[PDB]
Amino acid sequence: SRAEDYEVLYTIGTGSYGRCQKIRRKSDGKILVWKELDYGSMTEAEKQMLVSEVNLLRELKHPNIVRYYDRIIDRTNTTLYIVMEYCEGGDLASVITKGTKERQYLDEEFVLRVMTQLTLALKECHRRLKPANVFLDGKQNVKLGDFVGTPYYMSPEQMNRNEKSDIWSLGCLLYELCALMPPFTAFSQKELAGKIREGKFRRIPYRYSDELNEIITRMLNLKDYHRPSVEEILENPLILEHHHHHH
Numbered sequence: 001s002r003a004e005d006y007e008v009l010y011t012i013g014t015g016s017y018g019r020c021q022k023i024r025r026k027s028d029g030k031i032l033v034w035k036e037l038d039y040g041s042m043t044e045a046e047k048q049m050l051v052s053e054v055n056l057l058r059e060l061k062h063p064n065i066v067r068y069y070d071r072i073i074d075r076t077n078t079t080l081y082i083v084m085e086y087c088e089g090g091d092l093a094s095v096i097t098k099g100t101k102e103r104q105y106l107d108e109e110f111v112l113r114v115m116t117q118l119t120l121a122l123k124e125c126h127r128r129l130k131p132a133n134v135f136l137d138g139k140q141n142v143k144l145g146d147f148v149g150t151p152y153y154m155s156p157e158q159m160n161r162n163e164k165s166d167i168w169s170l171g172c173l174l175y176e177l178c179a180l181m182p183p184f185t186a187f188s189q190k191e192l193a194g195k196i197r198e199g200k201f202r203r204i205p206y207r208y209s210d211e212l213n214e215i216i217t218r219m220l221n222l223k224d225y226h227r228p229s230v231e232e233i234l235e236n237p238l239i240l241e242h243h244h245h246h247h
């Protein structure tokens with residue numbers, strides 16, 4: 001409830017809203033993180049918005065969604081700390097970078113794990129997305145977290161004016177995991193939007209099964225109503241028990 005109940009171990013990374021720090025909970029020694037949000041220049045209406053968003057994250061409990069634990073206020077520095085689960089395997093952006101630099105494609109079994117567990121995370125989100133926002137724990141489990149950049153994962157419909165848009169994004173992510181590059185690449189957003197609207201891309205590398213290529217390709221269909229639902233994804237014969245989470 002107070003920042004003094006935790007000890008900062010070190011800064012994991014400085015993100016958009018502030019730092020992500022690895023912390024230790026004094027009571028039991030539990031390793032967590034917290035995100036540092038400088039609410040200094042808010043904004044009573046904005047602060048109410050933030051409190052409500054924090055509430056609904058407080059209620060999002062799922063093995064494939066980064067767990068919320070606590071929120072702490074420290075007026076001495078205009079900083080709100082969001083205490084969350086620590087994912088010791090890091091984010092997927094780093095996995096993709098490691099693959100690119102070491103010129104080593106990822107195992108199809110890993111891609112099926114990501115597909116399975118992120119589809120389940122999305123199922124929960126729809127009930128109740130890029131490599132940097134997807135984390136691995138220590139037991140092979142996958143957890144969904146949360147102007148200069150290129151919207152590589154932007155779907156055609158969301159580019160004109162939708163849970164199927166999430167399916168398109170997941171397709172882009174799985175494709176990038178397989179090919180170590182996004183399906184649509186360009187140097188300007190006009191070129192990128194053109195490529196996205198045409199919906200053509202290279203097959204994922206041939207070391208990946210036709211079945212995996214087929215489901216990712218379906219997720220990348222230009223028409224949202226042709227992309228598979230979460231339910232249709234999880235029905236795929238590729239997806240087995242061992243691809244799900246395990247405590």
Ligand SMILES: N#Cc1nc(Nc2ccccc2)nc2[nH]cnc12
Nearest residue numbers: 013020084085086087088089090091
């Ligand atoms: N930012 C961030 C962040 N990072 C981790 N773990 C991690 C471990 C090694 C390398 C990189 C990341 N876990 C998190 N949970 C919520 N935010 C998290």
